[PDB]
């Protein structure tokens, strides 16, 4: 916990097989491999701390030692791979797992819903991303509802999703805590753009490769509604 | 006296009241689940709350008592002091109910023993709920309050939130509600009233039909979990899924529908 300095930034690519997120977000623009590697190394550090916790046989005895360690840190979770120990970490060590500043959840299994939609706490800022979505099922939306809801504030990143066109408004309406929204080369309807321009709790907005070229009821006609927009 | 689901000929109400006029030792008067008697109940309330007696526990419920009979009771609140639990719940006043209630509200200034007070339902009593507050805040012994069988709005929730500001009673344990028109911002609008009500035993908070917001599910479970008692609480008409029921804590019991 005393050590804060990173040190060497070479190698350490064993973790997170999707090192470049498997043809997803953090693409060619604004890569900065050096910062990506830091995030990976930090995540491994956090996991190591969790492993030490699991083997410390001190579930409640050493709550402070296992609080300071994680405070100010971030954790990455792949919805396609959720190790059993994650549940013990979050459920057996409350008021510590929540000390993390950020959780990064990519992609919907009910297991992801179970881990997040818990009683433990409403986690500060959740960063959630969607990749493999050619379709959005009602059950998927229902699950997202539960996942989005369990947070103080939300950051959402949607990339190359085909099932989202005409469904983005619906999904976004599930939770108004979203302040940061970006869409990567994913088609949207005017109704989706209207929803976005109509929500004034946004601070960050990023529009990539939207070629409707006709958005009267939308951002190209106004976008003066988002008074809280800063980015 | 305990009379339960006994059918009357619409005449005996008078004779019953006449017999009661000679009984002063009556301490409990329980008369509930009555048929369509209508007239004659006005005579009973005329004979009662008069000719001072030791009746402390009055439980007239589900009888279709006329608002005019309520007006009689209002006029006679000066009598039968020591009576503490006026009920008149599960009773609908088709008209003038809010006026009869208004008169009741501005009275009772001589009844310091009052507790566990249930309200009559009228069209529309919602307009006088802010008037109830005038005396409710003055009675630090109101263990329970029953406000049933009418729709509540978010405005009313906020008004109650002011009631639940609050000037503490420190003796409140049971609240109820038969139905409402409730949303996320109220229910949520009135939260922060459980911290100053640690001794809550139970509530109904029923609704015609509502699908609980996930924020409600999490907040409700955590808030109820930290309560001292939470003994046999109900939450009727709420569309909880299996995942939400799992989140809800090991309460003594829970009725969802």
Swiss-Prot record, chain A:
Post-translational modification: Phosphorylated at Ser-24 following infection of macrophages with S.typhimurium (Salmonella). Phosphorylation is essential for NLRC4 inflammasome function to promote caspase-1 activation and pyroptosis. PRKCD phosphorylates Ser-24 in vitro.
Subcellular location: Cytoplasm; Cytoplasm, Cytosol; Inflammasome
LRR repeats: 69-89, 120-143, 199-222
Tissues expressed in: Isoform 2 is expressed ubiquitously, although highly expressed in lung and spleen. Isoform 1 is highly expressed in lung, followed by leukocytes especially monocytes, lymph node, colon, brain, prostate, placenta, spleen, bone marrow and fetal liver. Isoform 4 is only detected in brain.
Leader sequence residues: none
Phosphoserine: modified positions: 24
UniProt subunit comment: Homooligomer; homooligomerizes to induce formation of the NLRC4 inflammasome. Homooligomerizes following activation by pathogenic proteins. Component of the NLRC4 inflammasome, at least composed of NLRC4 and caspase-1 (CASP1). Some NLRC4 inflammasomes contain PYCARD/ASC, while some others directly contact and activate CASP1. Interacts (via CARD domain) with PYCARD/ASC, pro-caspase-1 (CASP1), NOD2, BCL10 and NALP1 (NAC) by CARD-CARD interaction. Interacts with EIF2AK2/PKR.
Function: Key component of inflammasomes that indirectly senses specific proteins from pathogenic bacteria and fungi and responds by assembling an inflammasome complex that promotes caspase-1 activation, cytokine production and macrophage pyroptosis. The NLRC4 inflammasome is activated as part of the innate immune response to a range of intracellular bacteria.
Connected disease: Autoinflammation with infantile enterocolitis: An autosomal dominant disorder characterized by neonatal-onset enterocolitis, periodic fever, and fatal or near-fatal episodes of autoinflammation. Affected individuals tend to have poor overall growth and gastrointestinal symptoms in infancy, recurrent febrile episodes with splenomegaly, and sometimes hematologic disturbances, arthralgias, or myalgias.
Domain notes: In an autoinhibited form the C-terminal leucine-rich repeat (LRR) domain is positioned to sterically occlude one side of the NBD domain and consequently sequester NLRC4 in a monomeric state. An ADP-mediated interaction between the NBD and the WHD also contributes to the autoinhibition.
Name of this protein: NLR family CARD domain-containing protein 4
Organism: Homo sapiens (Human)
Complete-protein stretch covered: 510 to 767 of 1024
């Amino acid at each position: 916990a005393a050590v804060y300095q990173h040190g060497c930034l070479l190698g350490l690519s064993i973790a997170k097989r999707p090192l470049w997120r498997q043809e997803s977000l953090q693409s060619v623009k604004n890569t900065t491999e050096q910062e990506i590697l830091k995030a990976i190394n930090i995540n491994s550090f956090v996991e190591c701390g969790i492993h030490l916790y699991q083997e410390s046989t001190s579930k409640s005895a050493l709550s402070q030692e296992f609080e300071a360690f994680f405070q100010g840190k971030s954790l990455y979770i792949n919805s396609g791979n959720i190790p059993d120990y994650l549940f013990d970490f979050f459920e057996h060590l409350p008021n510590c797992a929540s000390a993390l500043d950020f959780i990064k959840l990519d992609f919907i299994p009910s297991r992801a819903v179970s881990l997040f939609f818990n009683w433990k706490q409403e986690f500060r800022t959740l960063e959630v991303t969607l990749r493999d979505f050619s379709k959005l099922n009602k059950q998927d939306i229902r699950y997202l509802g539960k996942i989005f809801s369990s947070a103080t504030s939300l950051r959402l990143q949607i990339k190359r999703c085909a099932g989202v066109a005409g469904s983005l408004s619906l999904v976004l309406s599930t939770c108004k805590n979203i302040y940061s929204l970006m869409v990567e080369a994913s088609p949207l309807t005017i109704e989706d753009e209207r929803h976005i321009t109509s929500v004034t709790n946004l601070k960050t907005l990023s529009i990539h490769d939207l070629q409707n070229q006709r958005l009267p009821g939308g951002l190209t006609d106004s976008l003066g509604n988002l008074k809280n927009l800063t980015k | 006296l305990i009379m339960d689901n006994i059918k009357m000929n619409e005449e005996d109400a008078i004779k019953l009241a006449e017999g009661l006029k000679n009984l002063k030792k009556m301490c409990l008067f329980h008369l509930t689940h009555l048929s369509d008697i209508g007239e004659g109940m006005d005579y009973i309330v005329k004979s009662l709350s008069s000719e001072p007696c030791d009746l402390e526990e009055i439980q007239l419920v589900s009888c279709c008592l006329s608002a005019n009979a309520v007006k009689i009771l209002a006029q006679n609140l000066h009598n039968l002091v020591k009576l503490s639990i006026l009920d008149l719940s599960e009773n609908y006043l088709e008209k003038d109910g809010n006026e009869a209630l208004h008169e009741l509200i501005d009275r009772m200034n001589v009844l310091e023993q009052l507790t566990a007070l249930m309200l009559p339902w009228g069209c529309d009593v919602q307009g006088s709920l802010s008037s109830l507050l005038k005396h409710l805040e003055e009675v630090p012994q109101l263990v329970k309050l029953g406000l049933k069988n009418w729709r509540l709005t978010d405005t009313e929730i906020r008004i109650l939130g002011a009631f639940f500001g609050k000037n503490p009673l420190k003796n409140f344990q049971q609240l109820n509600l038969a139905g409402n028109r409730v949303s996320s911002d109220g229910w949520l609008a009135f939260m922060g009233v459980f911290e100053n009500l640690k001794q809550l035993v139970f509530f109904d908070f029923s609704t015609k039909e509502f699908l609980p917001d996930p924020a409600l599910v999490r907040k409700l479970s955590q808030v109820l979990s930290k309560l001292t008692f939470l003994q046999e609480a109900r939450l009727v008409g709420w569309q909880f899924d299996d995942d939400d029921l799992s989140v809800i804590t090991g309460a003594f019991k829970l009725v969802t529908a």
